[PDB]
Amino acid sequence: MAAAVNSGSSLPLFDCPTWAGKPPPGLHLDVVKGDKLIEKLIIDEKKYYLFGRNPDLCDFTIDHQSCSRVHAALVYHKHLKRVFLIDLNSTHGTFLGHIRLEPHKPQQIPIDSTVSFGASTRAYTLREKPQT
């Protein structure tokens, strides 16, 4: 995995919106191959992350050749207090379980929800550290 971005002069890997804020210490991401939890991640640290393969740019890694360095990026709403998945012109596209997302337009992410990126057939189950 390398980076040979020659397009344009120099561009970032994402652009945090203005609806982004700060998530409380009680959130965390997840992944499901279908009916089995693969791994788990945290999302209660920043207000916007990434999702591709190259960590040198993104914070996470889809772990798929199909995907791209910056397949997409997440964003934690503030006025909604939820999450969002911005399909950064994903090679294929991003979905929210059974919904399709635009390659630019963000799509909120409910708790115990499920999202499926282009290749990664996973079912990113966005959870939320409930009551103990």
Swiss-Prot record:
Residue ranges, annotated region (Interaction with CDC5L, SF3B1 and MELK): 1-132
Species for this entry: Mus musculus (Mouse)
Subunit structure: Interacts with phosphorylated CDC5L, SF3B1 and MELK. Part of the spliceosome. Interacts with PPP1CA, PPP1CB and PPP1CC. Interacts with EED. Part of a complex consisting of PPP1R8, EED, HDAC2 and PP-1.
Observed phenotype of the null mutant: Mice display a retarded growth and embryonic lethality at E6.5, due to defects in proliferation rate.
Locations listed in the record: Nucleus; Nucleus speckle
Location of the FHA domain: 49-101
Domain-level remarks: Has a basic N- and C-terminal and an acidic central domain. The FHA domain mediates interactions with threonine-phosphorylated MELK.
Name under which the protein is recorded: Nuclear inhibitor of protein phosphatase 1
Domain of life, source organism: Eukaryota
Protein encoded by which gene: Ppp1r8
Taxonomic lineage of the native organism: Eukaryota, Metazoa, Chordata, Craniata, Vertebrata
Full-protein interval shown: 1 to 132 of 351
Task performed by this protein: Inhibitor subunit of the major nuclear protein phosphatase-1 (PP-1). It has RNA-binding activity but does not cleave RNA and may target PP-1 to RNA-associated substrates. May also be involved in pre-mRNA splicing. Binds DNA and might act as a transcriptional repressor. Essential for cell proliferation and early embryonic development.
